[PDB]
């Protein structure tokens, strides 16, 4: 079988220097360096993954499309939908209770 | 490179100010005989554009009506 | 390094638009999503922070200041608490009982938390392995293991030397001895098994 060697400067097996062999048209095996995964963006309240956005390293995030980084609601791609529902209910119902308490002063 | 499957879009690209060459490739099919498959390729600044023609007659028409200032290159 | 847990608590800025962060030793019973109140008029409840002069007798407290405005020094290790044991006639002074059993009088305007320090009772598990103690002090400081002075040469220790591994000396030394000499039992009022 054919054996391979590192083509780039790093010769150690770190997490940023992962490898994948590949077959070429000239008939030989060669090495190619693999990009690291990227964590998923997360909700600001319950720390759960936000639906509708891509997980990209910030270099690839910088040059990505505009619609791939956001959602169309009151808090977009920063707070999930369950949390927004509960926030709206809290706001309206607590204002109603405060206003009920205000009148009863007399 | 990119592929095009709309003839009108292909002819629109050919007339633009920075299209400088066409490639013509002729090649027998792998199934049978008398099957001159042809691809036509436009060299613009950014990409090659390739259109595939199964019909030698329609293809042969296409580059006849192609504007004279494009250099022509014959690979086969 | 520490055995007791920490609560991360967020207050709202009052001089300006913004938020601020605090780190506080957590008392047993606190939970995420709880509101605690700090001030001279806050209600008496577990986790609130109050001046010690507004607490009745018998209240269990932790995270106490021995001087006002000190930001807290006294009762801090896991499972520890103090007791309010006396309020002065004219205010200005409060008497407490400390975990070691000592009694102290404090300024009556000093602050403390109601309740006991969490994660208490962790010295009831036998350690049982040298590796467990290796992992315990690995994150504290370099103080483990310990060679005993009777197993050295005389150059390194007052106990060192000899043909039979003994001390040869009274092992209770005085409070005034110099630094290289205070090595056995320091200023011992008494030795032997305690019987009361």
């Amino acid at each position: 079988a054919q054996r391979v060697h590192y083509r780039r400067h790093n010769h150690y097996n770190t997490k940023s220097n992962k490898v994948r062999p590949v077959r070429t048209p000239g008939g030989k095996l060669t090495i190619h360096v693999v990009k690291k995964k990227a964590g998923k963006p997360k909700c600001a309240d319950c720390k759960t993954a936000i639906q509708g956005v891509k997980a990209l390293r910030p270099a690839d995030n910088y040059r990505a499309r505009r619609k791939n980084r956001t959602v169309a609601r009151a808090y977009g791609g920063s707070i999930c939908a369950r949390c927004i529902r509960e926030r709206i209910m809290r706001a309206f119902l607590f204002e109603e209770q405060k206003c009920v308490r205000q009148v009863l002063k007399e | 490179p990119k592929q095009i499957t709309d003839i009108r879009k292909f002819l629109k690209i050919s007339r633009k100010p920075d299209t400088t060459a066409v490639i013509i490739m002729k090649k027998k099919s792998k199934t049978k005989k008398n099957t001159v498959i042809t691809k036509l390729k436009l060299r613009t600044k950014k990409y090659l554009y390739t259109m595939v023609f199964a019909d030698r007659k329609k293809a042969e028409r296409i580059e006849n009506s192609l504007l004279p200032s494009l250099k022509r290159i014959y690979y086969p | 390094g520490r055995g007791a847990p920490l609560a991360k608590v967020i207050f709202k800025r009052t001089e300006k638009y913004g938020k601020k962060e605090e780190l506080i030793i957590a008392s047993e019973g606190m939970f995420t999503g709880q509101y605690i109140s700090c001030g001279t008029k806050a209600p008496l409840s577990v986790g609130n922070i109050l001046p010690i002069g507004k607490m009745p007798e018998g209240t269990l407290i932790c995270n106490l200041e021995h001087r006002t405005g000190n930001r807290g020094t006294l009762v801090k290790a896991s499972g520890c608490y103090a007791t309010v044991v006396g309020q002065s006639e004219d205010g200005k002074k409060t008497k407490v009982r400390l975990p070691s059993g000592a009694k102290k009088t404090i300024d009556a305007k000093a602050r403390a938390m109601v309740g006991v320090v969490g994660a208490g009772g962790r010295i009831d598990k036998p350690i049982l392995k040298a590796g467990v103690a290796h992992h315990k002090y690995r994150v504290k400081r370099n103080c483990w293991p310990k060679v005993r002075g009777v197993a050295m040469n005389p150059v390194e220790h007052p106990h060192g030397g000899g043909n039979h591994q003994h001390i040869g000396h009274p092992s209770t030394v005085s409070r005034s001895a110099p630094a290289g000499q205070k090595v056995g039992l320091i200023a011992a009022r008494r030795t032997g098994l305690l019987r009361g």
Partner: protein, 85 residues
Amino acid sequence: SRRTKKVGLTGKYGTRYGSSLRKQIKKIELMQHAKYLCTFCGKTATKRTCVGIWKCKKCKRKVCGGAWSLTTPAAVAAKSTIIRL
């Protein structure tokens, strides 16, 4: 079948350390690895995550508690005292 007569959970320790130390370890670790009722949501799904932190697998609240159990008696007594007032 029943695989062990006496030692139960401490059979991972083999024959080391002496029998009485293994007995105390068994008593402590029976409490350490159990499940506790979450008073907030009703399910019995609270388990220890670190030496003082307890967490509910369903509703995901975190409660500060004891070292080997969720409550120690000394805190319960003081809470009852305050609530009585």
